[PDB]
GROMACS .gro file of C-alpha atoms in nm:
model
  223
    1UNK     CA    1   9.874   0.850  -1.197
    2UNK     CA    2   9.694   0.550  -1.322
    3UNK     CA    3   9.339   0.447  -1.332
    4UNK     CA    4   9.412   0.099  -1.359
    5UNK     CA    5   9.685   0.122  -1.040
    6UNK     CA    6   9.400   0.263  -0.894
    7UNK     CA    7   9.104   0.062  -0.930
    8UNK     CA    8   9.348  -0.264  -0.877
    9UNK     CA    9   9.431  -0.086  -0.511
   10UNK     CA   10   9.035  -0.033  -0.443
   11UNK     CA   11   9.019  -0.446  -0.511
   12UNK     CA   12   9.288  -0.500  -0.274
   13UNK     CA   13   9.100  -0.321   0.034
   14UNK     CA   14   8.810  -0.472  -0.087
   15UNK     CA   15   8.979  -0.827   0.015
   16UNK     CA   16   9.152  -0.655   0.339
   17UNK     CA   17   8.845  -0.479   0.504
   18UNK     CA   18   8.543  -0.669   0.380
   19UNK     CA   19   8.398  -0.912   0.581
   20UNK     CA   20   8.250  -1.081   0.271
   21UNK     CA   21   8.430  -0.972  -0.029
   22UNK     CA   22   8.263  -1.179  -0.275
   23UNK     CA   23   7.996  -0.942  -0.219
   24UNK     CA   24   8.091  -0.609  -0.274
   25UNK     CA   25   8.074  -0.417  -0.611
   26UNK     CA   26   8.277  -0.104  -0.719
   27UNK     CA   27   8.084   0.202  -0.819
   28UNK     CA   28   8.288   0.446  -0.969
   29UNK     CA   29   8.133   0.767  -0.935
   30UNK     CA   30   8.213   0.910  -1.314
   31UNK     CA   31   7.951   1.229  -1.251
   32UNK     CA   32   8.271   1.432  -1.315
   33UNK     CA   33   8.440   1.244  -1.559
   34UNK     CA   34   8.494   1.297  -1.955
   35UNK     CA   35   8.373   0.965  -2.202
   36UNK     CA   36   8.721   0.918  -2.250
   37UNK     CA   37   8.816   0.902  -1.873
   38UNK     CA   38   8.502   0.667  -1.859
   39UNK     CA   39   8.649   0.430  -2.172
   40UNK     CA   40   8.976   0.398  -1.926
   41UNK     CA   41   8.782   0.281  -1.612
   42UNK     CA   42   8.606   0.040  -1.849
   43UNK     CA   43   8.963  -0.087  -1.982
   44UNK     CA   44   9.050  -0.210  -1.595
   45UNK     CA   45   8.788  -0.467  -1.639
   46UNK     CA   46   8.510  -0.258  -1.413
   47UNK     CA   47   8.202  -0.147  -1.553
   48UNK     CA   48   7.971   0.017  -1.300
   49UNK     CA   49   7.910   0.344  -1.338
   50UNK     CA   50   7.761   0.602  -1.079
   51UNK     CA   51   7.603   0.929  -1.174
   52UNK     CA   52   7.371   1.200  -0.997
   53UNK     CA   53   7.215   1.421  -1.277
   54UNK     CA   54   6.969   1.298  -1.529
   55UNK     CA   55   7.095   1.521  -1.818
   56UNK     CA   56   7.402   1.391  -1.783
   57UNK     CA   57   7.382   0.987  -1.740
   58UNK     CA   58   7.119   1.061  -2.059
   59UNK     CA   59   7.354   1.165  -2.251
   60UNK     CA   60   7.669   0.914  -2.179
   61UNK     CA   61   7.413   0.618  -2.172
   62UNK     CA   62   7.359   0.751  -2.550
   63UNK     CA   63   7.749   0.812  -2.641
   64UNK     CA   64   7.836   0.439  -2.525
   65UNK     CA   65   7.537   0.289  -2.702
   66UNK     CA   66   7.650   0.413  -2.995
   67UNK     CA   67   8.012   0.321  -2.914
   68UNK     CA   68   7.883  -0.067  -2.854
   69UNK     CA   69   8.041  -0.102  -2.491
   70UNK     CA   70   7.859  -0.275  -2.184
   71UNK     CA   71   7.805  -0.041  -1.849
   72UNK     CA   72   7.599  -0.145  -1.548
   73UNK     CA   73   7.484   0.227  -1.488
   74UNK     CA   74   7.360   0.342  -1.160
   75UNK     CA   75   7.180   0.621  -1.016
   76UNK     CA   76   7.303   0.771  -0.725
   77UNK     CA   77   7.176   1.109  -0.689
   78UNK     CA   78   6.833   1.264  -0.629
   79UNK     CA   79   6.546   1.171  -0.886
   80UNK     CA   80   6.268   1.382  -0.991
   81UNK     CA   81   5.992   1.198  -1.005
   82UNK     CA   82   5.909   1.352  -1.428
   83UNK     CA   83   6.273   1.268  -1.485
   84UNK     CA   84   6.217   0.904  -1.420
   85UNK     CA   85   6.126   0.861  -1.793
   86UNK     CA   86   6.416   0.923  -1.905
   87UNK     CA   87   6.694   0.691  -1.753
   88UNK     CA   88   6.385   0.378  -1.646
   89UNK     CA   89   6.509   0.193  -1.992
   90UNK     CA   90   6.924   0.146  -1.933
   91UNK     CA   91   6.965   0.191  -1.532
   92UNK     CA   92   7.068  -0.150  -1.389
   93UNK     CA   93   7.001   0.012  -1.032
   94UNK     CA   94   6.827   0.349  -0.860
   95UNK     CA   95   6.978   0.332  -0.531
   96UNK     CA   96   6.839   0.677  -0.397
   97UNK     CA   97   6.448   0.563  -0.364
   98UNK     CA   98   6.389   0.818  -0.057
   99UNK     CA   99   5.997   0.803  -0.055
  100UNK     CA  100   5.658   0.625  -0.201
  101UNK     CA  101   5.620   0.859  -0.463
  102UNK     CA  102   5.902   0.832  -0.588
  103UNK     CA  103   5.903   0.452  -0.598
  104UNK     CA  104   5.542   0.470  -0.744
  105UNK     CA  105   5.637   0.634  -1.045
  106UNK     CA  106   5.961   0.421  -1.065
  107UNK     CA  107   5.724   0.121  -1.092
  108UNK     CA  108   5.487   0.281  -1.326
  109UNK     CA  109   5.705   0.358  -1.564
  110UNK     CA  110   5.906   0.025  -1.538
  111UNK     CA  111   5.559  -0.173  -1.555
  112UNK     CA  112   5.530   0.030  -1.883
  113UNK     CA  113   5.829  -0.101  -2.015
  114UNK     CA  114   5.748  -0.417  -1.936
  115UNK     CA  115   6.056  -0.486  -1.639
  116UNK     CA  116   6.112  -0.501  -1.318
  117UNK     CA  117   6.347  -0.224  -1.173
  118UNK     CA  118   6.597  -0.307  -0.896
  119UNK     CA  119   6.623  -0.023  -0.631
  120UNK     CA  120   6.773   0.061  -0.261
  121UNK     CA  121   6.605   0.261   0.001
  122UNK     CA  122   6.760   0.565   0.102
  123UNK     CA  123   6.771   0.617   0.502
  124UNK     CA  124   6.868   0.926   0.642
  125UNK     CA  125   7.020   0.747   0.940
  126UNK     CA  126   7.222   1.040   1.090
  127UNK     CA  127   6.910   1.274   1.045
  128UNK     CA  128   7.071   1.592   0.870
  129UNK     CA  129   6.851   1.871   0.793
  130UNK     CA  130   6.942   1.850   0.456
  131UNK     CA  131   6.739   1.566   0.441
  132UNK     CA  132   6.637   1.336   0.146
  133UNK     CA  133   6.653   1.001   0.284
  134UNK     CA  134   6.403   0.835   0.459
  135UNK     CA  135   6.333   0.788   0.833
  136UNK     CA  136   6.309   0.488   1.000
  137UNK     CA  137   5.969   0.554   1.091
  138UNK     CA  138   5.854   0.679   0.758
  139UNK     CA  139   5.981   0.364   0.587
  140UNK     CA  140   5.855   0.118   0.823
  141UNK     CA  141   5.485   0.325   0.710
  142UNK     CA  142   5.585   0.280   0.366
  143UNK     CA  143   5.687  -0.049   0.384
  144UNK     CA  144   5.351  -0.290   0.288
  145UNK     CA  145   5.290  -0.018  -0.015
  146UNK     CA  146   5.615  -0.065  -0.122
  147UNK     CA  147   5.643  -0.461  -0.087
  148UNK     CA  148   5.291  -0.453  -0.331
  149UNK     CA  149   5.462  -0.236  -0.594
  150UNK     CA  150   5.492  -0.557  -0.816
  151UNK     CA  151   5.761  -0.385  -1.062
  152UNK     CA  152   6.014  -0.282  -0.822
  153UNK     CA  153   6.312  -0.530  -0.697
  154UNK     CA  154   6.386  -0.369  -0.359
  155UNK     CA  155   6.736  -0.534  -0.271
  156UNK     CA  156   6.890  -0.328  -0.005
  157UNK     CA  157   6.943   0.014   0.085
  158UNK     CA  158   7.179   0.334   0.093
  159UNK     CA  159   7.301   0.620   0.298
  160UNK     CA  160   7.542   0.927   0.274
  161UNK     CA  161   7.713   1.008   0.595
  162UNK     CA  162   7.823   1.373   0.583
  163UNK     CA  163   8.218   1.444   0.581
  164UNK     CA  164   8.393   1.375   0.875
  165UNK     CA  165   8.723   1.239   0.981
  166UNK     CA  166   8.563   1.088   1.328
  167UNK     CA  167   8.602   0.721   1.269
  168UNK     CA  168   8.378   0.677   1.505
  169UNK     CA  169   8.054   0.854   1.349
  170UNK     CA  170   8.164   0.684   1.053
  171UNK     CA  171   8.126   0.382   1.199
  172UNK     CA  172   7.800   0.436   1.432
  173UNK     CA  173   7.636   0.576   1.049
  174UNK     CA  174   7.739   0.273   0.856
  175UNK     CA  175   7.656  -0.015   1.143
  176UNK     CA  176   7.311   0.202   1.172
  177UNK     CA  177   7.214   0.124   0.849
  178UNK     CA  178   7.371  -0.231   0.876
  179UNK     CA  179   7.130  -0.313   1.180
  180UNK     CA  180   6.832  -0.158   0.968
  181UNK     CA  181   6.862  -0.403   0.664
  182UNK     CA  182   6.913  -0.635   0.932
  183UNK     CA  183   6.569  -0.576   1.109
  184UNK     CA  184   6.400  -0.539   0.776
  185UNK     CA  185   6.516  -0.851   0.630
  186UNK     CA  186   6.380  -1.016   0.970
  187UNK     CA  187   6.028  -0.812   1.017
  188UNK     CA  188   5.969  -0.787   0.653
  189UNK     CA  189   6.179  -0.907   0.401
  190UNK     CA  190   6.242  -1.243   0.437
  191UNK     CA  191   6.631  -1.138   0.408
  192UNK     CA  192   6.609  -1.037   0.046
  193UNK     CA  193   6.748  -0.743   0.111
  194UNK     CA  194   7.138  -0.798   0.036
  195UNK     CA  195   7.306  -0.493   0.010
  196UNK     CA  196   7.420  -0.187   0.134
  197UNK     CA  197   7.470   0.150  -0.059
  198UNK     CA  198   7.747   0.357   0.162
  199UNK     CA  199   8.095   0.433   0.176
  200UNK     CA  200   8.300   0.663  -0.098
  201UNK     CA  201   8.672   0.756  -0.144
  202UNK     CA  202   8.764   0.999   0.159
  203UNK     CA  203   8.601   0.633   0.403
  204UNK     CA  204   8.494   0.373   0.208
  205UNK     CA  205   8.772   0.147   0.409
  206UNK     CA  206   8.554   0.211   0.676
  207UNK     CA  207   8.236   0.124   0.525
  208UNK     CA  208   8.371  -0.238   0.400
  209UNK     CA  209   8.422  -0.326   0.770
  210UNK     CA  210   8.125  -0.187   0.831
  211UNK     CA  211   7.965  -0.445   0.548
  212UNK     CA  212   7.928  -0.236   0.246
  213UNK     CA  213   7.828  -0.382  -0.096
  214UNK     CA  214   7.868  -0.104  -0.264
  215UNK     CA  215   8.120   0.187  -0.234
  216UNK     CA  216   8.093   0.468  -0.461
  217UNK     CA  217   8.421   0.614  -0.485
  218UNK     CA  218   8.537   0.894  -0.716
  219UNK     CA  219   8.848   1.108  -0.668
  220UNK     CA  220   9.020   0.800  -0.552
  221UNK     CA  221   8.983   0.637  -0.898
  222UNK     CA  222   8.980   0.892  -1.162
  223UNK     CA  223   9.209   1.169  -0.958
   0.00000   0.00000   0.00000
């Protein structure tokens, strides 16, 4: 196999299924991945970088610091609100904000540092009982609080849709959340809200018809 192969491949259904290409960013999800399988994805010309555990995107943000090489991280897993301190310096983008606490203490801690912190909102939009994300409802609530918090850049949102091989629950999740940036960037945003956090490797094709701007894909890259 080959990363490179792989990641050029990715670009190429990026073109096919997108309905705006020029848009859409890789993520590649390295939570599993060795600093040297990292340094590879890095060598195909791509440099964001997904991870879900604090410890761990602490410690690579460190290792490639010292190693001098440019990453866009991002945060894609669940955030603590006392582990905010520790990634608020060198994350280009949180994209699982999933309530106002959470993006309180994200713009505390970014106000301290003197920056302004881009985030997504995370919507539960198929409403699994493992839940994290936020409701409709809920964020519509949130929504004046948030818009005030003066240190946060909200520029889209994000979802999960469990695994499935239904193309069409695939497709009802991802236009859900489509039509919800959609309203909010009508009712509330003033359309500054351009992307959309969804999609990884087992149907991101499905999420770049759907509109995605982001697809966080994994095993497809590095396996």
């Amino acid at each position: 196999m080959s990363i490179k192969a792989n990641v050029e491949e990715i670009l190429e259904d990026i073109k096919k299924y997108s309905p705006y290409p020029e848009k859409v960013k890789l993520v590649a999800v390295t939570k599993y991945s060795s600093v040297e399988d990292i340094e590879k994805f890095l060598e195909t010309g791509q440099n964001i970088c997904g991870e879900n555990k604090v410890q761990v995107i602490k410690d690579k943000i460190e290792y490639f610091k010292e190693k001098n090489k440019k990453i866009k991280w991002h945060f894609i897993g669940n955030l603590q609100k006392n582990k905010v301190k520790y990634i608020i310096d060198d994350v280009d983008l949180i994209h699982s904000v999933n309530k106002l606490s959470l993006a309180q203490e994200i713009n505390k801690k970014a106000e301290q540092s003197s920056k302004i912190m881009d985030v997504l909102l995370e919507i539960n939009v198929y409403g699994e009982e493992s839940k994290q994300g936020y409701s409709l409802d809920e964020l519509k609530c949130d929504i004046i609080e948030l818009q005030n918090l003066k240190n946060l850049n909200i520029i889209g949102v994000m979802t999960m849709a469990p695994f499935t091989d239904d193309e069409k629950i695939l497709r009802m999740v991802f236009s859900e959340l489509r039509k919800i940036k959609d309203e909010l960037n009508k009712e509330y945003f003033n359309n500054n809200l351009t992307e959309l956090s969804m999609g990884m490797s087992s149907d991101y094709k499905i999420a770049l018809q759907e509109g995605s701007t982001f697809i966080r894909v994994g095993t497809k890259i590095f396996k």
